[PDB]
Nucleic acid binder design. Sequence first.
RNA 1: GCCAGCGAAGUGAGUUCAAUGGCUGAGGUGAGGUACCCCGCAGGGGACCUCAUAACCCAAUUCAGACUACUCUCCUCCGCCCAUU
Lengths: 247, 236, 147, 362, 69, 121
Amino acid sequence: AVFADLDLRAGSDLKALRGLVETAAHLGYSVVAINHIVDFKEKKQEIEKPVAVSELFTTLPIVQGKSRPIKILTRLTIIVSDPSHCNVLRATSSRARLYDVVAVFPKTEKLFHIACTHLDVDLVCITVTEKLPFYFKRPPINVAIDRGLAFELVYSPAIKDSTMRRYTISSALNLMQICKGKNVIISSAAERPLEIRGPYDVANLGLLFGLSESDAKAAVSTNCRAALLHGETRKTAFGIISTVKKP
Amino acid sequence: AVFADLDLRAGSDLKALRGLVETAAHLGYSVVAINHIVDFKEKKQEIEKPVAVSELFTTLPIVQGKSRPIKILTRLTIIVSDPSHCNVLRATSSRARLYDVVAVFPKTEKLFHIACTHLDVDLVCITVTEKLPFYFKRPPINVAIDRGLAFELVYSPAIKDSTMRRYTISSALNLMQICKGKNVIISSAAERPLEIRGPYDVANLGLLFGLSESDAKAAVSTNCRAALLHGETRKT
Amino acid sequence: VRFKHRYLLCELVSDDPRCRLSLDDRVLSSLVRDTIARVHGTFGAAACSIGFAVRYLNAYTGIVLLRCRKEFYQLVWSALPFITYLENKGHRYPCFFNTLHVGGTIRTCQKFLIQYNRRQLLILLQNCTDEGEREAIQKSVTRSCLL
Amino acid sequence: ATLRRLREAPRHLLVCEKSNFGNHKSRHRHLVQTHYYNYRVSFLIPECGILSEELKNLVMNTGPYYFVKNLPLHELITPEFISTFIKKGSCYALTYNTHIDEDNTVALLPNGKLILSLDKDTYEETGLQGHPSQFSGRKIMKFIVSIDLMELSLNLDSKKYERISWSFKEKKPLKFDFLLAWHKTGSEESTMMSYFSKYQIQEHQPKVALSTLRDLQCPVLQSSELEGTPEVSCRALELFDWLGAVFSNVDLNNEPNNFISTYCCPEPSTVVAKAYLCTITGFILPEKICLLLEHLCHYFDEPKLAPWVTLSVQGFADSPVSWEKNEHGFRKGGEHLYNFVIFNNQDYWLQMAVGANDHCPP
Amino acid sequence: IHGLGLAINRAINIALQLQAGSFGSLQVAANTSTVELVDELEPETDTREPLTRIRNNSAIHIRVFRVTP
Amino acid sequence: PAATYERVVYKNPSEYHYMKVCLEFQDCGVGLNAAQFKQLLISAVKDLFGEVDAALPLDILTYEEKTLSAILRICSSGLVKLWSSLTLLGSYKGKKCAFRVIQVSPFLLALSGNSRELVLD
RNA sequence: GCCAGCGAAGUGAGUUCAAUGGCUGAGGUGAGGUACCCCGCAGGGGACCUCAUAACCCAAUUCAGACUACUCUCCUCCGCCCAUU
C-alpha cells in the first residue's frame, strides 16, 4: 500500500523546486515525482541531463512517516494536439529510453483513441482550461482499464481564477459516469510553495468527484501503485527485468 | 390525500389579498388560511369580524387540480415576548371561541417550556430573523410531539434580503437535530402578490431544509392535515 | 452506452405580461445557470451544466422544459423557488412554478401538457364570459377534433 | 448516487455498559488487562484542590518505555530474547510512526503472538502464512501474519521455527523503530539496557501534565439510567461528548456575536467549583492502569464531596490488533478508546469507542 | 353509459357529477328501453323439469355529447 | 444503590464530527480574529457548496491567535462539505494561503491526545 | 436450383430526444462474539450485537439453442506446496 504519490509540474529554479520537496515531505508524501511540460510548438525535448537528482539535492530528504528517503523520479507530460507531432513520441521507443513514467495530454477524439489503444503510454492527462469540451467515449475507456492505463486527473483550480473550479468538477463527473472508477488518480500541479494539501485531505477531493466511498483513499495509494508500476514494465522490458548487482 | 394546505400572513387591502387567493388556487392549494399579527405593542383584540372572507370573496374558489372549492380558514399568530402577555391567551379562550387553529410565537426558553406543556395552542411559530438568540432544548420538544403540538417555519428569503437567507436555513437545522420530523410544517408569508411557491415545489424545499428524503412531502400534506384535525376538538 | 435523463416542467405565473414577451433561450440559459451559482457554489453550477440544455419554450404560453441527469436532478429542482429578479430593460418580477417532474420520457411529458391545457380552457369559459373569446374557444375545440 | 455519499455517514459505533465492581462475573479487569496498547491516560476528579500523595506517586511511576532505532525483526525471535523477557513476563513491541495503511507494522502480544501487518510488497517476499485484513475493493493491499512464539519455544528445532528464522535473517532484512517496554514479572531481574547494548536504546519517561480547572459545569447523573431521564438526569451519550471538551480546555458560555459558539452544556447540570486535571502521555502499560483502576475504586472508601470520578484511556492511532481480535484500520480517522465513569456505590459506566473499520467485544 | 334496473340508480349518479366535474357544456340525453331476462331454475331431481320464467328489466342510455360552448 | 447489568450497542449515535484546525500563511502579517475566522469559513463554503451550506451548524472552539489552532464541528451531512471547501484556499484578502488538517475524530476525547505524530521525539 | 405473406389499437417491464434494478427497518445465508435463557452428556439450541450480500452489465417485437464476458455464492472432480501423525 504505497501511499501519497504526486505529479508536480514546476521547474524554473532550484530554490522553488527544493521547497516543494521539503513541503511534500512534511505532510504525508513518500514518493514525489516531477513532470516536464513539452509542447508541440517548440519541438524541443531536453531528455539528456534535465534534473540531476543526486547532484542538485542535499543528500537527505526526511519525511514524518518511516523516515525513508523520497524516491524522486522524473516523469514526462507531452502536450499533444496534432497527429504529425505524436510520430516523434512514437519514435522514442528506441531512441531515448528515459523519463520512467510517460504521460500524454490528448486534445482530439481521433487522438484520444489511439493513445488508449495503440500508443504505449503510462497515464493520460485530462485537464480542461478555458472552455474545452470533450466527449468521453466508452470503447477507449473499457480497453484502458484492462490494459493498465490510468488517468492523471490533475487538479489546480485555485491558482488564478475561481472559474477554473467549474471546469475541473465538470470534466471529472463526465468521467465518473462513464469510466465507473477503476483506475483514476488525482494530483496537484503546484508552482507556488503553498499549493499542496495533505493526502488525508486529498482523498475527499476525489470523493468530491465521487469515484467511491472507499477507493478514493485507494485512488492515491492503490491506483497510484499500479500506475507507477506500469512505467517500470515499460522502462526495461515487459516480462524480464535484469538488474546489475555489485556488492 | 388532501395536499398543499399552507397558511398566509396577508392583510393590506382586498386587491392584494384576493391576488394571493387566485394564485394559490392556480397552483395546488385547497386549504388557504389567513394569519393575523397580534403583538404586545398595540394590544388589539379583533376576533369577531376580522376579514369575513366568505362575505367578501365572490363565492367561487376553483383549482385546476382536483377541481374542488377551497376551505378557507381563519388562524391567529400571537407574538409573545413577556410572560405577562401569555396570560392574555388563557383569558380569551373562553370569551370569544373563534380562530379554530391557534399559533403562538415564543421568545424565551422558560416561556417555550410552558408553551409546549401548559399553554393550549395548536402550532408554534419559529422564525429567527436578524440575530434572534433562541436555543432549542430536548425535553420541551419531546413533550410536544407526544401531545400533538406542531412547529412552524415561515420563510421568505428569495426577494427581500440575502442576509435573511442564512438565518432561515441555520435556525432550521438546529431544530432538525432534536425534533426528528414527527410534526413539522413549513408555511410561507406573503405580503407582495407574488410570494408563494408551487405545490410540488415545497417537497424539494423541505428537502432543501434537509429533514427527510420522502417525509418532506408529508410535511406539507400529512402534518398540515393534523392541524385542523387536532384543532377541531379544541374549539368544540 | 446511453444516459438516463430527467425532464422538469415550469410555468411563469405573473402579472404585467410584457415579461412573458421577453423570453429567449439565450436569456433562459444565462438565468438558470447563474442562479445555481448564486444559491449553490461552483459544484452544482457545473455538475448541472454538462447535461443541462433547453428543448421546449413558448414565450406566448409560458412552459419551460429543462434537461438534467439522474444523479443531479435534485439541484435544479431545488433552485427553482429562488429564481427572482429577471433583470432586463424594464422592471420585471417573474417566478417559476413546477407542474410534474417527469422521469425522462418526452412523450408522456407532452401528454401531461395536453391534460393541463384542456383543464385551463374549460375553467376559462364561465369566468371570462366574453362572446368574442368563446368563439375562439370553439375554434380550439374544432381544430383539436381534426387532429 | 453522487449526492448520497457526500452527506450520508462514516462508520462509528459506541457500546455503553453499566455494571458493579463487586460482581463476581464482572469483566472490568479482563477488558483492561487484555487491551494491549495505550498512549493517553487521563483522569478527572471534581472538587480536588489537594491531591493524595499515594495517587501522585502512582502517576510518576507508570513507565518507563524504551525506544530502539533500526532494530531488525530477527533479533526479537532469538531464544535469548524469548527466555529473558517473553518467558519470564510480558514484553511489548510496536513499530513507531509506521502507519497501519502505509507501511509495514509489527506488533507483539503478551501471549507470545507476534502479529505483524505487512503490505503486498513484503508479504510475498517473506513467505509467511497470513490472511487478508480489510478489503479495498479487489486489489487486496494489506496482509496480517500471526506468529505464536510460545508454541515455537517448545520445539526450537522444528520446521516451523526454521522457516520463520530464515525468512528474517538472509531472506528479507526488515528493521524498524520499536516502542519497547517490559513488565517486571520474573525472579531474575535483568534490565532492557543490558540486552540492547549494541543498538541505540533510549530510556523515555511518560509526560505528566498536572492542571487544576476552576468553575466547571458538570452534569447530573443517575447510575441506574443510561438513556437519561427528562429534566432530572443526563444521558451517558451526552457525557461522552462533554468530557473531551474539558480536557481540551473548552469551557465557554453563550456569546451572541459574529463568532457564536453553539456548544451548550448537557442539562440538567451542577456548578462545580474545582476540577483536577491530569494527562499521562507515553507508552502506558495496561497493568499500571489496573493499579490505577483499583485505586479509583478505593477512592470512595471515605465520604467524598465528589459524586463521580473519571478514568478515560485513549489508545494509539497506529495499533494493529487491540481487544485480542480486532484489526484496527485507518479510514480517514477512527481511534479506539474506553472510558470509566466510576460512582460512589461501586458502579461504573463502560463507554468503548469504536473507529471506522473496527469491531467491539463485550 | 349503459345500466340495468339496479345499475341505473347509480349510473345516473356518475353522469350528473360529471357536469359539475368536467365543468363544460355536456348535453345529457337519455333513452329508455326493455331488456329481456330469462331465468332458469332446475333442482337435482329426476322427475323435475326446468321451468324457464319470463322477466323484463328497465335500462337507460344516458348520452353525453361534447357541445361547443 | 443496586447491582444490575445492561448491554446497549449504539450504531452511529454521535451526529457530530470534530476537526483540529491548523493554518499556514506566507507573510508574517497574521491579522486574524475569532470573529474574522468565522467569516472565512462562511465565504469558503459559499464559493463551492453555496449559501445554503454556508450556514451549516459550525462553531469555533479554543481559538488561539499565535498558534492559529481551533476546533470545528458539523454533523454527518457536513463533514464532507467542509473538507472540500477549505481545500481550495479560501483566503480573506487575496494573499495566498493553505489549510492543512491535523486530525479528524467525531469526539473531542479522541481528538485531544494526538493522531498525527503519536509521539514527539 | 427455384416458388408462398398480413397498415390497423394495447408484451404477467414495454421505452421509443429511449420509463424501471429506490431508501429505511426487520430477516435469510456466510464469518465473529457473549456477564443472556432453556434442555443436563464435557455438549447443543434459542436470544442479542458487529460485518459481508458482489462482479460482469443493461430490455427496444418476442421465444428456444449455441458462443462469450463473471463471483457475494453452492455442488462435482482434482493438482501443487507447507505443516502434522
